Write a protein that binds this ligand. Structure first.
Ligand SMILES: [Ca+2]
Ligand SMILES: [Ca+2]
Ligand SMILES: [Cl-]
Lengths: 133, 131
């Protein structure tokens, strides 16, 4: 029985014209190891625009916008070792475009693949961010 | 007699004329066209006049036929990259490539048939999933 959960970190407040790097990882994964990770970041397009997705060199990242406010991200290990937990694996770069209070950032539709190609769902998470003038 | 050797050379050139390299279904993996070109040129050398023996001509036909087979094997199909063979390409398939990075023994995961599993396969699977 596999369980797990997403990690999500970002600044709590940014100003219009400033980037917000939204760091996504795996908080916990029980009874499986993950060599790849598929998740969707949801945000308010009235508040932010999507710029790109970035990663540090032990991980390969590709992302594609699905619709305004919705970006799908794929993360895979380049190390020959599973993706570690408790580390930012990918950062989704948003850019603040307009003031907003309690703007929601949520990770949904999150799953991992193991070395044998088996897929497991993991629980999403959410946090809020303010955009000031 | 070089008729059949010339016919195989023309088959190869036709494959080149008609093919494009890329990540999409119906395209060929990066490098496929270069590889076939090297082999067509080998065959062309034997084809070109002089005192090529019937065994030289036969070896050339054999090698070029193998090259044509290799080229065709590099065609991207609907199911290319669906490794567990469960009818779709997803994060499990990407995970299999990742776990097997550096493998020289996984000759079903080696999509571009270059002898190892590396960032090519990673890039291919990422592209197919998202597009
Ligand atoms: Ca599959
Ligand atoms: Ca390869
Ligand atoms: Cl997703």
């Amino acid at each position: 029985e596999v369980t797990g959960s997403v990690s999500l970190e970002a600044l709590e407040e940014v100003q219009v014209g400033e980037n917000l790097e939204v760091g996504v990882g795996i908080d916990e994964l029980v009874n499986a190891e993950a060599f790849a990770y598929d998740f969707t970041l949801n945000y308010d397009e009235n508040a932010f625009e999507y710029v790109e997705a970035i990663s540090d060199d032990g991980v390969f990242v590709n992302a594609k916008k699905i619709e305004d406010g919705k970006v799908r991200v794929l993360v895979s290990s380049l190390t020959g070792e599973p993706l570690p937990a408790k580390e930012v694996l990918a950062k989704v770069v948003l850019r603040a475009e307009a003031k907003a209070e309690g703007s929601n950032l949520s990770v949904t539709n999150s799953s991992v693949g193991d070395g044998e190609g088996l897929v497991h769902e993991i629980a999403g998470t959410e946090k809020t961010v303010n955009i000031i003038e | 007699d070089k008729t059949n050797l010339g016919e195989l050379i023309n088959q190869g050139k036709s494959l080149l004329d008609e093919s494009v390299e890329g990540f999409n279904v119906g395209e060929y993996h990066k490098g496929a066209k270069d590889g076939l070109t090297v082999e067509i040129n080998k065959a062309e050398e034997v084809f070109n006049k002089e005192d090529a023996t019937e065994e030289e001509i036969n070896l050339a036909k054999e090698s070029l036929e193998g090259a044509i087979a290799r080229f065709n094997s590099l065609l991207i199909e609907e199911s290319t990259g669906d490794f567990n063979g469960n009818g779709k390409i997803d994060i499990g398939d990407l995970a299999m490539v990742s776990k097997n990075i550096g493998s020289t023994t996984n000759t079903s995961l080696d999509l571009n048939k270059d002898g190892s599993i590396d960032e090519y396969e990673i890039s291919f699977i990422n592209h197919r999933i998202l597009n």
